[PDB]
Design an enzyme around this catalytic site. Structure first.
Site, PDB file in Angstrom:
ATOM      1  N   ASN A 146      78.081  25.110  61.499  1.00 15.46           N
ATOM      2  CA  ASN A 146      76.687  24.728  61.682  1.00 15.46           C
ATOM      3  C   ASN A 146      75.752  25.598  60.828  1.00 15.46           C
ATOM      4  O   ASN A 146      74.532  25.594  61.029  1.00 15.46           O
ATOM      5  CB  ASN A 146      76.278  24.778  63.169  1.00 15.46           C
ATOM      6  N   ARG A 284      70.503  36.352  65.480  1.00 14.32           N
ATOM      7  CA  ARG A 284      70.644  36.771  66.883  1.00 14.32           C
ATOM      8  C   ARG A 284      69.386  37.544  67.223  1.00 14.32           C
ATOM      9  O   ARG A 284      68.889  38.352  66.423  1.00 14.32           O
ATOM     10  CB  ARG A 284      71.892  37.616  67.122  1.00 14.32           C
ATOM     11  N   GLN A 313      70.681  34.773  77.205  1.00 13.28           N
ATOM     12  CA  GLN A 313      70.609  33.334  77.097  1.00 13.28           C
ATOM     13  C   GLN A 313      71.375  32.706  78.255  1.00 13.28           C
ATOM     14  O   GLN A 313      72.507  33.116  78.519  1.00 13.28           O
ATOM     15  CB  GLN A 313      71.137  32.802  75.751  1.00 13.28           C
TER      16      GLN A 313
END
Ligand SMILES: NC(=O)c1ccc[n+]([C@@H]2O[C@H](COP(=O)([O-])OP(=O)(O)OC[C@H]3O[C@@H](n4cnc5c(N)ncnc54)[C@H](O)[C@@H]3O)[C@@H](O)[C@H]2O)c1
Ligand code: NA
Lengths: 384, 375
Positions: A146, A284, A313
């Site tokens: 991705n 990140r 998260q």
């Protein structure tokens, strides 16, 4: 064997029965020559929602067909969670960065049968790599799957910050017009100095996409690109990240999270940046000091911050990045576009087939194996 | 002599005393070789808000220093406006397309001292050119000045629609996470087919910015680009627009409004588009039928619409494009970024210097030269 797989919840009104379009592009190779994933078979149609609880990464037919137990849950917090119920006897744990099943020291101590921790996506920092090394757990991810997805989201966020898109859209949606309010901090990106932290798959893809905007391109990395790539993109290399940030209008962060990058963008680093610099961080969250970013935005030292990554998260409802001035945040979405999902879901399957058949996992996918950083892990991560 | 300048209202909490940044890039040339404006001097720092009333296009010191009178106003509508009250003895009238002071036949007949009608920006459709020529009036604008600005806005909007940015940002801001909601209609543009209606300055700039996204590029126009330009960008030409829209995932509109583009994107044309197609329109609203677009995003035939152009303009508070699902709209702004303003404001000064010194205005800026044609 038991496969324990943690995925994000279905949409609020339920798993979708239809999609916005009939097909997505077929991407078979990446810029560096790496092939897209090569599972022997898939049990989904590219474009379906795979990363939610009902999507199951298209794995149930395959795993239940081999006679394994496949547990899919979104419930991942604390000792009473469905995740912690099954942790003690899972041989394989799968989760995605977007909704990560954290594997710290204690959870890894408790996972008595765990042999493989698979990141459905890219970036395995939600696993404590030192502890995985200690316990002889293989850590793998779907390298490259991705990276382009993120590069697009990152350029989108650079342009939105610089042009003042989100505030202007809010004026339109609310019934206003307010041209001067829209443009009192609207700039073109043309001619700005734009620099990336790292020039790996995402960093390079962003450089290439920014080039025709006629920006001045910079990068920091531990090792340089080829001189041919530097000359083609017109890159200025900085040996020291400090030197890069001093001259950039825009800094885009594109490195993995490990001890070298943890809190690289702390108060002192941010202070070296130009007044009115922008940061985009789709890598990140914890490459940045959370509260230092907030203070610099609020003071006007940074003109804006945008990214899709947070810590922890899911981010709590009161996370300060949600409401800080001029932010262009999303939840962690870029790597889980339906397009991105198709590739990391195929690669998840590819890795499992290798595992169960006793075939080598691609080196590109390996982060930890045989009690050390290995493959991509040895190239792109460190442990103390 | 009197210069009459119409500009948009200041920001709601006042003209800014500080800005987000200290300097902006110095853009010196455009893609086709045209140079960016070359005033002898400027009395603003590039980056200032120049296009609002208090900004004054940074002209007041210069004009008053020459002994002229400089009137700045945002009040331009109808016969009792400040604009109309000063119209009869203005030698020079200046306005922007973002807040245009209309000069139709009636007004130009009343503007008995007018010699120069100057557009600060690009787009002088609100000036009647036939009447300007009859009255000996020169009409000029700052050609090339914010083409790039528009192209960036358009590409930004393409990516935002396809990736579902705005709804996801609403989830973030309101305290949610909701990944499946964010991505159940989030796609990569990589490998999609992207087409432009027209390939003039803006359309060409968009095509060049989209190329490294590894999209398949298409265009429709009345006249083709050179073979070398088509081959450099990997363009497929469509002589008919229907053939382009049938194969495109994204259509960006970069054409003028005239009888064969008016409601080009109507009910019939939209039905020929791929299910889930996206439209971006930074050109003219009326190239698209308003309610056809709304019905298509509501039915799911279009997966998104975005632009900064409206009909009427300014858009009424209840305009349906404001609140229709999956829209990426802004108010009209792309060409009045602070960067675009710096260039068209420098161009305004350059033209005014030429004018008062008796030097020719650059050919690129002149729309009609009533002075010359009157001889
Ligand atoms: N959805 C998302 O937002 C999303 C998706 C995928 C990846 N990511 C993040 O982006 C990161 C990069 O992904 P990628 O596909 O480009 O990976 P990659 O391995 O191709 O590139 C990472 C690059 O970072 C470099 N790097 C490592 N340590 C560094 C340091 N201290 N300073 C500078 N550079 C350093 C490596 O040498 C490498 O060139 C991932 O590790 C992940 O954390 C985010
Ligand atoms: Na720290």
């Amino acid at each position: 064997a038991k496969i324990l797989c943690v995925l994000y919840p279905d949409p609020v009104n339920g798993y979708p029965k239809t999609y916005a379009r009939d097909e997505i592009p077929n991407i078979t190779v990446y810029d560096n020559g790496q092939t897209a994933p090569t599972p022997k078979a898939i049990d989904f149609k590219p474009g379906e929602l795979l990363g939610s609880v009902s999507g199951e990464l298209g794995l149930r037919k395959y795993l239940e067909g081999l006679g394994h137990e496949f547990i899919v849950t979104s419930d991942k917090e604390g000792p009473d969670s469905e995740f912690e119920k099954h942790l003690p006897d899972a041989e394989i744990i799968i989760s995605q960065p977007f909704w990560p099943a954290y594997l710290g020291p204690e959870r890894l101590a408790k996972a008595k049968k765990l042999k493989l921790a698979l990141t459905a996506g890219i970036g395995s920092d939600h696993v404590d790599l030192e502890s995985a090394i200690k316990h002889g757990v293989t850590v793998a991810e779907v390298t490259g799957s991705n990276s382009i997805s993120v590069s697009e989201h990152a350029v989108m966020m650079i342009l939105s910050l610089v042009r003042n898109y989100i505030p202007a859209h809010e004026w339109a949606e609310k019934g206003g017009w307010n041209i001067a309010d829209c443009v009192e901090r609207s700039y073109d990106v043309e001619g700005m100095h734009v620099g990336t932290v790292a020039a790996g798959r995402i960093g390079l893809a962003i450089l290439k996409r920014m080039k025709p905007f006629d920006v001045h391109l910079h990068y920091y990395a531990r090792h340089r690109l080829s001189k041919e790539e530097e000359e083609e993109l017109g890159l200025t290399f900085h040996e020291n990240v400090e030197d890069m940030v001093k001259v950039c209008d825009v800094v885009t962060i594109n490195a993995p999270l490990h001890p070298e990058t943890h809190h690289m963008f702390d108060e002192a680093m941010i202070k070296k940046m130009k007044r009115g610099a922008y940061i985009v961080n789709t890598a990140r969250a914890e490459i940045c000091d959370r509260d230092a970013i907030v203070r610099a935005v609020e003071s006007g030292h940074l003109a804006g911050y945008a990214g899709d990554v947070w810590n922890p998260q899911p981010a709590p409802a009161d996370h300060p990045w949600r409401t800080m001035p001029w932010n262009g945040m999303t939840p962690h979405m870029s790597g889980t576009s339906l397009s991105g999902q198709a590739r990391y879901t195929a690669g998840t399957r590819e890795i499992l087939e290798c595992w169960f058949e006793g075939r080598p996992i691609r080196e590109d996918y390996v982060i930890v194996d045989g009690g050390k950083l290995a493959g991509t892990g040895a190239l792109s991560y460190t442990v103390l």
